[PDB]
Design a protein around this ligand. Structure first.
Ligand SMILES: Cc1cc(C)cc([C@@H]2c3cc(C)ccc3NC(=O)CN2C(=O)c2ccc(Br)s2)c1
Ligand SMILES: Cc1cc(C)cc([C@@H]2c3cc(C)ccc3NC(=O)CN2C(=O)c2ccc(Br)s2)c1
Ligand SMILES: Nc1ncnc2c1ncn2[C@@H]1O[C@H](CSCC[C@H](N)C(=O)O)[C@@H](O)[C@H]1O
Ligand SMILES: Nc1ncnc2c1ncn2[C@@H]1O[C@H](CSCC[C@H](N)C(=O)O)[C@@H](O)[C@H]1O
Lengths: 328, 328
C-alpha cells in the first residue's frame, strides 16, 4: 500500500461487476473482428485493461492502452499475466501528450456518465480522434443518444410520506415535516443519480440529442451545448417528481448495431439514470401533456460547472424554468 | 429552501426509520415514568425533538430541548404541532452556553456513534451533567459498554474473490488483482462502519469498556482513554479479516434495565458495527486463541484524530500492532 485506494477498487469493481456494460463491450468489439483483425487500436483510459484485451481477442495486431493515473500499474500486470505484452502496450500518462509510433485504425473508450469527469473524458477521446485516428477509422462506441421522460420516483414518494407514519408507530405526530423533507429532497438544483424501474416512467421517452462521435467538427460543436425540445402525454394518475435522463451508445456490427442502453426499462447498470427533480410534486392524469426544452452546456471557466437548463410545462400549469449544475 | 439539506434529512430519516433505536428510547423513557412525572429534563441535542416529546408523554413537567444547529426550527414546529409548547421549550444554540432557569432532574441524549462528532457529543453531555444536573439526577441512557470480537466479513470475502471469477464470465484472467484489492480494502488504517450478521462472528464477544455516565470524574478520566485486554477462542475454520467493535447502552427500569444493543446477533440498527481490518486475511481453526489489547484515545490537538490502538495475536503468529484513526 502506497495510497488509500478503498474508493479506487470500488469504481473498477463496479464496472467489472456490471454484466450489461461488460457484455456490451465484449460482444460489441468481437462483432467488429473483421474490421479489427491485423489492425491497430488506441484504448483511451484503459483502467485495468479489459477493453484492450477484448480488442486483442478480436484480432488486433497492436493495442495502445493509455492510462493517466496509478491504475496503469494494474493494467501492465493484467496484460503481462494474460501473455499479451507483445500485442498490448500499456502507456502511462494523459492521451493528450502520449506519443504513438503510428496513426491507429480504431479508438475504443468508456467516457460515458454524469459529471465533469465524463465531460473531460469525452474531450480526451475527441482530442485523440483528431490527433491519432486514421481518415475513416473506427470509434467504439460510434454514437451516443440522450433520452428524457417525466417520472414518479417510488423511493422518493416513500421517503416524503415517512413523516406521516410516525404517529401510528411511536405515538408522536411528525406529519408537519413533509414540507421540510420536500424542500430538502426536491428543492435543490443538483442532478441526482438514482436507479428507477419501468413503472416510475409516466410517458414515452423522447430522444433530445444524438452525437456521431466520428464527426470532424464535434469538439467545436459541443462548445454550444447539446439539447432539444420534447413533448409527451402521460399514461395515468401519478405524482410527477420530475424528469429522468439516460443514454445509449451504439457499436457498429459486421449486421445490426449493438446498443448499450441505460433505460429504466432495461437491465440495471452502474450508470443508473440522472434525475431532475421539480421543486415539489405535480399531480398528472391520463393524457396530461408534458413538454419543454433541455440544454446541456459545457463547463468553460474555473470553477467548472456543467449547466443543465430545463424549461417545462405540465398540463395547464404555467411554463417554469429549473436549472441544475454539476460541480464534480 | 435556504440551504442544501439533502444530507440533512437523510440523517434524521435514518434515526426515525430505526425502530430498534426509536423503541429503545420510547420504552426506556416510559419505564422511568415514576422518576420523571412532575420533574424537569434537559434534552441535549434535541434534533427533530422526538426524545423531548417522549419525556413529556412520560409525565415530565418541563423539558428543555437544546439544539445547536438549524434543525432547531423543525423541533420548534414539531413541539407546537403536538400542543406541547407549554411543557417543552426548544432552545437554540450549544448546550455549553444555554441558560436554564433551574438545575434539572434528568438529562436525555443520543450521543453514541463512531467518530469525532460523537466524541464531541459525549463531551457536550458530560459538560451539561456537571453544569445542570441536580445531585443524584437521572441520565438516559445511564451507562455504555463496548465489545470486540474476531470476524470473517462475508461481503469482503465475495469482493476479494471477485477478480478470480472474470475468466469464467468474460474470458479474461484478472486473478492477479486479488493482491491489489486486498491492499486497497484491508491495508488502510481507517475504521469501516459496516453491518455484519451473527455468522460473521468467529468467537465469544469480549467486553473491553464500561462507562457509568453519572460518575463525577468521567470527563478527566476520558482524557487517558478507554480500553482493555481481551482473549477468546475461535469456533471453527474461517478466513479472519479483523475485529468488530460495537456498543450497548442501558436505561434503568422502574425492574431490570432496558438494553439498546448494536451487536451483529441483534436486529440491525443505523449504527451497524465498527470494523478494524487486518492488513490481510489469517486462517483460523476451532480453538485458535485470539488475544490483544484495544485502546481508544481521545482527540486533543488540531487536526483532531481519535486514535484506535490495537495489538493482537492470532494463534501461533507473532503479536502485531495495527493502529487506526478517525479524522471526521
Ligand atoms: C453519456 C453522455 C452523452 C452525451 C451526448 C453527453 C453527456 C454529457 C455531456 C454534455 C456536454 C455539454 C458535453 C460533454 C458531455 N459528456 C459527458 O460524458 C457528460 N455529460 C453529462 O454529464 C450529462 C448528460 C446528461 C446530464 Br442531466 S449531465 C453524457
Ligand atoms: C458508543 C461509544 C461508547 C464509548 C464508551 C466510547 C465511544 C467512543 C469514544 C471514545 C473516547 C476516547 C471518547 C469518547 C467517545 N465517545 C464516542 O461517542 C465516540 N467513540 C468512538 O468514536 C469509538 C468507539 C469505538 C471505536 Br472503534 S471509535 C463510543
Ligand atoms: N486524458 C486522459 N488520458 C488517459 N487516461 C485518462 C484520461 N482521463 C481519464 N483517464 C482514465 O480513464 C479511465 C476511465 S475508467 C476505466 C475504463 C477502462 N476502459 C476499464 O475497463 O477499466 C480512468 O482510469 C482514468 O484515469
Ligand atoms: N454542543 C451541542 N449543543 C447542542 N446541540 C448539539 C451539540 N452538539 C451537537 N448537537 C446536536 O445534537 C444533535 C444530535 S442528532 C439528533 C438526536 C435527537 N435526539 C433526535 O431525536 O433527533 C444534532 O442535531 C446536533 O446538531
Amino acid at each position: 500500500l502506497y495510497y488509500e485506494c478503498y474508493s479506487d477498487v470500488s469504481v473498477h469493481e463496479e464496472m467489472i461487476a456490471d454484466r450489461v456494460r461488460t457484455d456490451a463491450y465484449r460482444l460489441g468489439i468481437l462483432r467488429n473482428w473483421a474490421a479489427l483483425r491485423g489492425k491497430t487500436v488506441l484504448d483511451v483510459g484503459a483502467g485495468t485493461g479489459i477493453l484492450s484485451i477484448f480488442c486483442a481477442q478480436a484480432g488486433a495486431r497492436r493495442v495502445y492502452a493509455v492510462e493517466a493515473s496509478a491504475i496503469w500499474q494494474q493494467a501492465r500486470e493484467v496484460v503481462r499475466f494474460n501473455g499479451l505484452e507483445d500485442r498490448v502496450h500499456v502507456l502511462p500518462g494523459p492521451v493528450e501528450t502520449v506519443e504513438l509510433p503510428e496513426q491507429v485504425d480504431a479508438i475504443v473508450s468508456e467516457w460515458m456518465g454524469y459529471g465533469l469527469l465524463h465531460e473531460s473524458m469525452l474531450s480526451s477521446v475527441l482530442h485523440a480522434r483528431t490527433k491519432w485516428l486514421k481518415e475513416g477509422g473506427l470509434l467504439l462506441p460510434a454514437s451516443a443518444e440522450l433520452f428524457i421522460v417525466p417520472i414518479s420516483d417510488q423511493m422518493l414518494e416513500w421517503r416524503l410520506g415517512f413523516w406521516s407514519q410516525v404517529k401510528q408507530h411511536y405515538g408522536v405526530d411528525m406529519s408537519c415535516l413533509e414540507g421540510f423533507a420536500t424542500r430538502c429532497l426536491m428543492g435543490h438544483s443538483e442532478i441526482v443519480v438514482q436507479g428507477l424501474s419501468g413503472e416510475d416512467v409516466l410517458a414515452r421517452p423522447q430522444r433530445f440529442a444524438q452525437l456521431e462521435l466520428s464527426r470532424a467538427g464535434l469538439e467545436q460543436e459541443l462548445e454550444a451545448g447539446v439539447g432539444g425540445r420534447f413533448r409527451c402525454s402521460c399514461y395515468g394518475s401519478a405524482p410527477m417528481h420530475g424528469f429522468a435522463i439516460w443514454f445509449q451508445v451504439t457499436f457498429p456490427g459486421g449486421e445490426k448495431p449493438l446498443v448499450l442502453s441505460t433505460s429504466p426499462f432495461h437491465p440495471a447498470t452502474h450508470w443508473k439514470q440522472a434525475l431532475l427533480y421539480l421543486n415539489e410534486p405535480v399531480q398528472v392524469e391520463q393524457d396530461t401533456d408534458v413538454s419543454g426544452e433541455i440544454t446541456l452546456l459545457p463547463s468553460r471557466d474555473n470553477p467548472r460547472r456543467l449547466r443543465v437548463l430545463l424549461r417545462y410545462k405540465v398540463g395547464d400549469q404555467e411554463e417554469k424554468t429549473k436549472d441544475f449544475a454539476m460541480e464534480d
